[PDB]
Design a protein around this nucleic acid. Sequence first.
DNA 1: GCTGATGCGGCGACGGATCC
DNA 2: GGATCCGTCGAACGCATCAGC
Length: 270
Amino acid sequence: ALYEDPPDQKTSPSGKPATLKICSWNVDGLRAWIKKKGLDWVKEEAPDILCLQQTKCSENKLPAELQELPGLSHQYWSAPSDKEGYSGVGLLSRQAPLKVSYGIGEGRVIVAEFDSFVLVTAYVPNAGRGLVRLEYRQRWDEAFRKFLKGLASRKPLVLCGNLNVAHEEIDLRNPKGNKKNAGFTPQERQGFGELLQAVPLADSFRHLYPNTPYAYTFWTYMMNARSKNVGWRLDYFLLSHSLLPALCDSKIRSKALGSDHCPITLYLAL
DNA sequence: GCTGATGCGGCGACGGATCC
DNA sequence: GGATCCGTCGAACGCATCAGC
């Protein structure tokens, strides 16, 4: 079954207008994504803040098109030192953040503090084929939760990006045949449930659309999975509970091409 | 400098068994 | 004997290194 994201809801449940638009995109190769016109899509989306994951690009190789985004002029990039062509994340913002830091105290995490909230974008480590990196993922999950818990102690938190797990069976097309697969192990799902519990956080999209199936943000390049919408929901906006009144909508931009992930977009009334 | 090989890291199609 | 359940396997991508010119 194909999926059609509902129209953008730009007013909070109470009736306040959205003032902040955040777009998160796992671009799977920033340079390839730019050549596949992904930045033309960003310009049409016109977000206040853009978070990118899996850029696979060091700062000295960023294409000059990125210096031509005047409404996203404050840019922060993080790549691994060891493995240049892998991982990597970026955060672009219309306004300067108050503070920016990297890591969770790998080029996987950027933390940016704004006036009324802290934003984290993450490329969560994949468990690997054959689950060869699942134990590392479990240790990483626990270190990440502890780091996030110790941030939400100040302002509310928005966490976005590729969290590399489909939380529940509704979050992927083939839950039964993938329960031993990276992204849908009981270990990764439980780690997600624990993140929501411990910090605490809510899944923005699931909060608004608790029963909507076939909503995915990732499709393997092979076996024409995307045209069949055989996909996984791996990309999220998770919010502190104190931000749920401010939540207008959480979108999945199914039609935007240029990666094996599609963009996601958050509308907040702050 | 440039190309294209190879290497590495991000599962759905399918073939076979079991169940009523 | 259709539905379901399970383990096996081939392959689209992006980017790195490397050879060769």
